[PDB]
């Protein structure tokens, strides 16, 4: 009576049914791929691509489909926001339906392989017992793997035949799926260099093909074969688990730290961007330029794109979220409606006061207004018995340039303090928290969720490698 945690060990020595069980897993994965996509498409709003991006709508699979090219939809809408003139068979819905049909086909294939498990192919010719030439099996699979890798990078990514990959400006203000050209240089190893993807996939692909030929031709060393139990299926399983958990960590870091493969306008902005004021510096930069040109403060702030300002918001920060705060980013803060405009806080003396932005590590941060020198000149005191920086005594007035409150000045202590609290959270945008009944708490972006899930899987798979690997090394002792 196999224990519950040893029931799937029945096919360990049944190559015919091993394919079947693997076919099942592949079918389930394919089905979820199309199923989740169909669900997301059914719950996605493409009306506003600026203040309501996919990552704000909590979409997870949609970003990946868009990353490789899928942009139009049979709904007559493009992820760009324009009408899908001809979405074609490869519409978001089409690709989803394809995966679902593939799942079904895999299921029927699994049934056949399960029923007809006793195939002479699995049997070894010398003895007749079921035996798999793991050495060659890896070689043939590696050769095929290399082919696809090179083809994807030299065609789909390059664009010669494939549609292309999603590339965006450093500030993700403007980007789409355009054919890229392999860098083939030192810059090719820059994670934010899109060209690297094509160059790397082409290089890695050709090598993989050659490596596959080697494993197919050259046989394993006698000392290596026994030393690495190259005759054990669990041996490849343990080593394969090591590879998947290794990649998971690399993939997660790429998503968290950001890269050309993780567009900020497809997965949302990275936490480090806010920590370094990436978008904020740009906004102020162009503003200063417009002022240098001679435009009024309103003109400069009016020039600022709402999308750029939207990026400059603690809410879009992926780290600003909770483990059980489930739902789309739109829920918890509302659906962005518009930009109130830049808020300028000035004391009675006329000194310009800057509201210290909330550090990501801080769930709640005290409101502080500092001068250009960096000296606190005003704040909202917790104790008002004898304040020395009270917004009232300092007499701070907030004037909004550009946006909805363009040209609007506020001197009411309460009104100024309200905007000051928003200012510390970055650009002040209008949000509709009624349609979704937002709870008023920030949520994590799909970027953060993906990183958390894959890092967790990676850490667990480490135990899997040690477990299956230990069993292979101590097979004699574990034998029973």
């Amino acid at each position: 009576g196999l224990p519950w945690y040893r029931v799937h060990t029945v096919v360990i020595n049944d190559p015919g049914r091993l394919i079947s069980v693997h076919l099942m897993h592949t079918a389930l994965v394919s089905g979820w791929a199309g199923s989740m996509a169909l669900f997301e498409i059914s719950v996605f709003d493409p009306s506003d691509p600026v203040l309501n991006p996919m990552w704000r709508q909590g979409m997870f699979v949609l970003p990946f489909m868009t990353r490789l090219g899928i942009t139009q939809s049979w709904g007559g809408w493009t992820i760009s926001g324009e009408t899908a003139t001809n979405p074609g068979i490869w519409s978001y819905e089409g690709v989803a339906a394809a995966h679902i049909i593939l799942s079904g086909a895999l299921f029927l294939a699994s049934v056949w392989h399960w029923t007809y498990w006793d195939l002479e192919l699995f049997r070894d010719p010398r003895t007749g017992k079921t035996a798999l030439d793991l050495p060659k099996i890896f070689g043939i699979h590696l050769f095929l793997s290399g082919l696809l890798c090179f083809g994807f990078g030299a065609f789909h990514v390059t664009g010669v035949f494939g549609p292309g990959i999603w590339v965006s400006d450093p500030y993700g203000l403007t980007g789409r799926v355009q054919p890229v050209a392999p860098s083939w240089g030192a810059d090719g190893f820059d994670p934010y260099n899109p060209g690297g993807i094509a160059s790397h996939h082409i290089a890695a692909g050709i090598l993989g093909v050659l490596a596959g030929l080697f494993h197919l031709c050259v046989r394993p060393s006698i000392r290596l074969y026994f030393g690495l139990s190259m005759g054990s299926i669990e041996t490849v399983l343990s080593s394969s688990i090591a590879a998947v958990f290794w990649a998971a960590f690399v993939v997660a870091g790429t998503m968290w730290y950001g890269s050309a493969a993780t567009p900020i306008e497809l997965f949302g902005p990275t936490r480090y961007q806010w920590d370094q004021g990436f978008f904020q510096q740009e906004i102020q930069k162009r503003v200063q330029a417009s002022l240098a040109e001679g435009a009024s403060l309103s003109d400069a702030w009016s020039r600022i794109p709402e999308k750029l300002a939207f990026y400059d918001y603690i809410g879009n920060n992926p780290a600003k979220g909770g483990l059980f705060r489930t739902g789309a980013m739109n829920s918890g803060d509302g659906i962005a409606v518009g930009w109130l405009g830049h808020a300028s806080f000035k004391d009675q003396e006329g000194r310009e006061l800057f509201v210290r932005r909330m550090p990501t590590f801080f769930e709640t941060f005290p409101v502080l207004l500092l001068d250009k020198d960096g000296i606190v000149r005003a704040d909202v005191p917790f104790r008002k018995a004898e304040s020395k920086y009270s917004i009232e005594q300092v007499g701070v007035s907030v004037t909004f340039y550009g946006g909805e409150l363009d040209g609007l000045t506020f001197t009411d202590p309460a009104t100024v303090k309200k905007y000051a609290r928003k200012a510390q959270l970055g650009e002040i945008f209008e949000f509709d928290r009624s349609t979704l009944q937002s709870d008023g708490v920030f949520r994590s972006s799909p970027r953060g969720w993906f990183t958390f899930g894959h890092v967790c899987f990676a850490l667990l798979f480490f135990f899997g490698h040690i477990w299956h690997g230990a069993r292979t090394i101590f097979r004699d002792v574990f034998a029973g």
Binding site: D275, G277, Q280, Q281, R356, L370, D371, K372, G374
Partner: peptide, 23 residues
């Protein structure tokens, strides 16, 4: 007015502009 840094720093002391060239 205030320099971008004279603005980014008071808003965010850990801003790259303020955290760079400081020597």
């Amino acid at each position: 007015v205030t320099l971008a840094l004279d603005k980014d720093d008071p808003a965010k002391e850990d801003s790259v502009k303020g955290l760079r060239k400081d020597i």
